[PDB]
Nucleic acid binder design. Structure first.
Lengths: 229, 171, 454, 49, 102, 59
RNA sequence: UUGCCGUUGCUAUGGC
RNA sequence: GGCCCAUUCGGGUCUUGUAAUUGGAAUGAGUACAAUGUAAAUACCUUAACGAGGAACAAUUGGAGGGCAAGUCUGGUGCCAG
């Protein structure tokens, strides 16, 4: 009854935890019970993960948010107070949620793909992201599928990454879900299979969608740290 | 298991008489069980002979079959050919059981003394006390069949008959 | 070609199993287990310690100060030593006596301190295998082992007992019998920096104990002849060798599982390998071990082989065929009984009955680059293992030890770049298990100490 | 069921000494003699065709 | 004489706890004797005897070994907070009965 | 011993079945509670009495 | 420097 | 004296029998201390104490053949046949 992304062992139970509503969707997130209890194993059961949630160790996106099924989606920096645990969780190359450990100056921010820019009411420019941070007043040159950098103390955009040909992009969606390498090709079609294409070890080619891909930095310099093997 | 084709011919009756008497068996079901799975084994080895040399099935399943037959212990280390699996037979299989092996190693005086030692738990291969007589010891567990350390024929405290006789003679 | 087809089909099979280096190469389960690895405790006992003391060619060899302190005990059998983090040593003999030494006076011969001699007084009054709880040895003490902390020495032999003596007084604090009739102990080894003893008993059994709790941990089974030697390091692994089954096993003792390593040298293929252009042959019995580090060990055989084995290869990595020579052939005045030298020479059959010396002692200094081999060739040999860990090589010899070497081990001194060691070796005129040894050529029952430097 | 086959096999291998001549294990001690008789008229050998 | 072996000791700061697997060794004894085992565990580790706890005991066939799950706390009060109520009924001090109706 | 409860249960059922037809009803009553039997057991005992389908005798 | 015994050194060896 | 073959006469073979006495060992079903397990309880696992001579702590089912009475019945060319 589980998805593939959670890295959930089959010998666990019968009812799978539906995440509650929140920032991200159901299909692109993992809740805190499947995060803490059975992935990096700070708990043994739902009772004691509710106990540490009542103790309020979790500090995801700089706020506490004491809830069992809180849908932590892409790169919400899970922060735990004891042993200064800073966790940025991204996608691995085979579809799961690889939770990388980072440090404090990297967990002081996150980034987010812009979805739409609106002239909503009363002359106010407007920007949303995958956690829905409706932050005030970016520059006019925010296209769709660019990348804002959230402040995580206040909410303001601090840095901006422009989407164009020659940018380091992350793909979350479809049969390319979780690949990095961002350059063999660029092809913007007019309604589907439109993208920037991603290399491999032998620099192979790949096809995805615009909304299923979003930028993380430059060719060699992302200010996100990434795990390795 | 499964019953044979003609179960009541006189050669079969004298066969089962010799087998049950020479190996201390309780009924026909021991012979019929071990012969049923031996029938499966060499019915498979017959097909492995009816296919040809350099067949993948023959190469891999043949050396797999003779190596796990050698490790059960019914086949010696040097005959690594597949026609010896056809030459194999039923008392080569029930010489490997623990009652036969306890008697042959000499912890018992007969196969019936071996059967009652095993069912009274004085015999342990390796670490665990084995207590059923038809156990099919392997070529590595062949040399650790010894008296259990929980038993008066090992070194343990003597049983109830010995200690009650000692107490009544102390009275 | 059938083996070629087997190799080819196995290669295709492994390729198909793979079917069912990029810039991003991170795996979620591996990094999660590495987070648990960052979370855990006890990076102390379980070091998979490699060879960190590379000093084989460094120290001197040829001018050791060799003192052969002869003692009046028939057929010394074992040697146990001790260093804290004054040093004591222990010997034991076939005359049922344990003897404590001080050894820390490094530039001179060791000093006797205390006897502890069992005898016929300690035969139990029962002949019953579980009331073997006497306080002394009545038969053939074969092995001593000093504690890594030094509170106790623990010894045992063919009287199927483990008597644990205190260090400061040589008094029997506790007796633990091995509870069966053939339960003679043959080798003892503490795991390093601990209180856990591994005894190897001739029931094809390995018993383990905690000495300061007077308890037995685990009995572990699985050799096929008598477990003639044992060896351990700081890890809870152990390495035993049974004699004639020609296999050496190493035991994950908490898991109670093992890795077996058989021998497998054949004079047919070996004489063909020489025939491509010679007195070397098959194997009798693997006899002695010492775990050099937590990935390699070395075995001493019955045909004079010394072999070097890894943790990742069944067959051995390196051999050394003749390690102490071949024995002097029996004389023509002691073979035949004819009159003429021609027939008494015909009764030698040429070279067919020359038998090699068998290595009866082997000691690898733990995690170091150098080990010491000993038999009744009169000369101990010192070998260093090459830094790529795929070979060893004879450095030099220590030729002041006339007799069988029933035990070798070393005693350390000096700091990280300047070091000096005294190699103790128990010397007898008789093998430590049975007699079997003729042509006692100037042997004496002593302690061969050598002081090696630099 | 086990003791019955123990005692009908002992009966069978006591009857087998009657029909054949069973190899008992060779000469025990000193050769005392045939202990039962020698028949000079009987030949218990299988003739061909 | 029972014998004790801890393995795979990790620390849980979120639950203020230190947890491990417990190989309990009793040759020629019956079984683990859990209160005596809590005594032996509380003296091999530090004092906290009402903050050390074991729950998952499985003895292998033929006796001798048993694997349990050991978790030891500092601060007996937060041990009472974090442990479940049935184990507190089993070992410690808590006792609240369920209302028996229907 | 619920083991011996089940053993004597089966033995009484078989010995009762040799005296009545093979497949008669042996009923099991537990301990008396407050002067009389458990009313669950007496309820389905009366359920067994209510369907019995008597056959006519001769005398 | 030892179970005796010999050379001993004023310490090393060799016969049981 | 037992056993085996054979239509017959007979032949072949050999330590074989006996409600004969007797001896100390073994333990398992059962009865049961517990502890473990588990929300709790059952069960599995581990386990001290007792537990065999008709070891009565009393396994069946089916077959082949006799032999006996101051006995009974039938037939009829005594004492027989059935």
């Amino acid at each position: 009854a589980a998805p593939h992304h959670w890295l959930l062992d089959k010998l666990s139970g019968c009812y799978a935890p539906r995440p509650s509503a929140g920032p991200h969707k159901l299909r692109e997130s993992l809740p805190l019970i499947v995060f803490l209890r059975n992935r990096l194993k700070y708990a043994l059961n739902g009772r004691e993960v509710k106990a540490i949630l009542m103790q309020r160790h979790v500090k995801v996106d700089g706020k506490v948010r004491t809830d069992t099924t809180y849908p932590a989606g892409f790169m919400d920096v899970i922060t735990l107070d004891a042993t200064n645990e800073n966790f940025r969780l991204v996608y691995d190359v085979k579809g799961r949620f690889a939770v990388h450990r980072i440090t404090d100056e990297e967990a002081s921010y996150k980034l987010g793909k812009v979805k739409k820019v609106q002239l909503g009411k009363k002359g106010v420019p407007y920007v949303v992201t995958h956690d829905g941070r409706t932050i005030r007043y970016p520059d006019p040159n925010i296209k769709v599928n660019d990348t804002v950098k959230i402040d995580l103390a206040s909410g303001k955009i601090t840095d901006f990454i422009k989407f164009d040909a020659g940018k380091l992009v992350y793909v979350t969606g479809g049969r390319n879900l979780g690949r990095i390498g961002t350059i063999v090709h660029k092809e913007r079609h007019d309604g589907g299979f439109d993208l920037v294409h991603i290399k491999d070890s032998l620099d192979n080619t790949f096809v995805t969608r615009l909304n299923n891909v979003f930028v993380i930095g430059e060719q060699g310099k992302p200010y996100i740290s990434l795990p390795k093997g | 298991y499964s019953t044979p084709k003609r179960p009541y011919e006189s050669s079969r009756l004298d066969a089962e008489l010799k087998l049950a008497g020479e190996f201390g068996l309780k009924n026909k079901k021991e012979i019929y069980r071990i012969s049923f799975q031996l029938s499966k084994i060499r019915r498979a080895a017959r097909d492995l002979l009816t296919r040809d040399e350099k067949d993948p099935k023959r190469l891999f399943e043949g050396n797999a079959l003779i190596r796990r037959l050698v490790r059960v212990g019914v086949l010696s280390e040097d005959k690594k050919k597949l026609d010896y699996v056809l030459a194999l037979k039923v008392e080569d299989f029930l010489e490997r059981r623990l009652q036969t092996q306890v008697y042959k190693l000499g912890l018992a005086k007969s196969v019936h003394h071996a059967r009652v030692l095993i069912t009274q738990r004085h015999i342990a291969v390796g670490k665990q006390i084995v207590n059923i007589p038809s156990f099919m010891v392997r070529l590595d567990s062949e040399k650790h069949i010894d008296f259990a350390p929980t038993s008066p024929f090992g070194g343990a405290r003597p049983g109830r008959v010995a200690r009650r006789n000692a107490a009544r003679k102390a009275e | 070609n059938p083996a070629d087809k087997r190799r080819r089909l196995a290669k295709q099979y492994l390729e198909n199993l793979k079917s069912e280096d990029e810039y991003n190469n991170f795996d979620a389960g591996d990094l999660d287990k590495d987070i648990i690895a960052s979370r855990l405790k006890e990076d102390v006992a379980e070091q998979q310690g490699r060879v960190f003391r590379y000093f084989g060619d460094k120290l001197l060899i040829s001018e050791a100060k060799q003192s052969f302190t002869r003692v009046g005990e028939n057929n010394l059998t074992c040697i146990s030593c001790f260093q804290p983090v004054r040093l004591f040593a222990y010997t034991v003999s076939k005359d049922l006596q344990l003897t404590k030494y001080d050894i820390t006076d490094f530039s001179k011969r060791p000093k006797k301190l205390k006897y502890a001699k069992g005898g016929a007084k300690y035969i139990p009054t029962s002949k019953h295998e579980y009331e073997n709880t006497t306080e002394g040895h009545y038969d053939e003490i074969l092995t001593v082992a000093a504690s890594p902390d030094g509170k106790y020495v623990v010894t045992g032999g063919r009287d199927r007992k483990l008597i644990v003596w205190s260090t400061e007084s040589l008094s029997p604090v506790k007796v633990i019998p091995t509870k069966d009739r053939r339960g003679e102990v043959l080798s003892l080894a503490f795991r390093k920096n601990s209180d856990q003893l591994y005894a190897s008993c001739a029931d094809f059994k390995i018993r383990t104990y905690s000495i300061n709790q007077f308890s037995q941990l685990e009995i572990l089974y699985g050799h096929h002849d008598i477990v003639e030697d044992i060896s351990a390091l700081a890890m809870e692994r152990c390495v035993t060798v049974g004699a004639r089954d020609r296999t050496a096993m190493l035991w994950k003792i908490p898991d109670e599982t093992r890795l077996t390593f058989r021998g497998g040298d054949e004079p047919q293929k070996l004489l063909r390998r020489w025939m491509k252009e010679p007195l070397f042959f098959c194997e009798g019995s693997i006899d002695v071990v010492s775990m050099v580090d937590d990935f390699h060990f070395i075995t001493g055989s019955d045909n004079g082989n010394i072999c070097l084995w890894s943790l990742a290869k069944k067959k051995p990595i390196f051999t050394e065929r003749i390690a102490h020579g071949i024995l002097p052939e029996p004389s023509f005045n002691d073979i035949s009984g004819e009159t003429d030298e021609e027939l008494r020479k015909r009764q030698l059959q040429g070279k067919k009955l020359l038998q090699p010396f068998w290595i009866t002692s082997l000691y690898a200094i733990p995690y170091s680059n150098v080990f010491i081999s000993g038999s009744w060739s009169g000369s101990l040999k010192v070998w260093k293992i090459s830094d790529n860990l795929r070979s060893f090589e004879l450095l030099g010899e220590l030729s002041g030890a006339k007799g069988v070497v029933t035990k070798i081990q070393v005693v350390e001194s000096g700091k990280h770049g300047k070091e000096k060691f005294r190699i103790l070796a128990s010397i007898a005129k008789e093998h430590r298990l049975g007699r079997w040894i003729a042509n006692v050529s100037g042997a004496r029952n002593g302690i061969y100490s050598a002081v090696i430097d630099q | 069921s086990r003791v019955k086959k123990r005692k009908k096999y002992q009966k069978a291998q006591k009857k087998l000494k009657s029909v054949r001549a069973v190899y008992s294990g060779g000469q025990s001690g000193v050769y005392e003699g045939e202990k039962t008789g020698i028949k000079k008229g009987l030949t218990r050998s299988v003739k061909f065709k | 004489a029972v014998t004790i072996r801890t393995r795979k000791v990790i620390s849980n700061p979120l639950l203020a706890r230190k947890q491990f697997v417990v190989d309990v060794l009793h040759p020629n004894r019956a079984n683990v004797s859990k209160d005596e085992l809590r005594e032996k565990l509380a003296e091999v580790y530090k004092a906290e005897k009402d903050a050390v706890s074991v729950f998952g005991f499985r003895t292998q066939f033929g006796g001798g070994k048993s694997v349990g799950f050991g978790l030891v706390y500092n601060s007996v009060a937060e041990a009472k907070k974090f442990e479940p109520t049935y184990r507190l009924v089993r070992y410690g001090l808590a006792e609240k009965v369920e209302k028996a109706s229907r | 011993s619920q083991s011996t409860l089940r053993a004597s249960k089966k033995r009484l059922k078989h010995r009762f079945w040799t005296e009545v037809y093979q497949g008669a009803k042996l009923f099991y009553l537990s301990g008396v509670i407050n002067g009389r039997y458990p009313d669950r057991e007496i309820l389905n005992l009366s359920r067994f009495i209510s369907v019995m389908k008597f056959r006519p005798l001769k005398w």
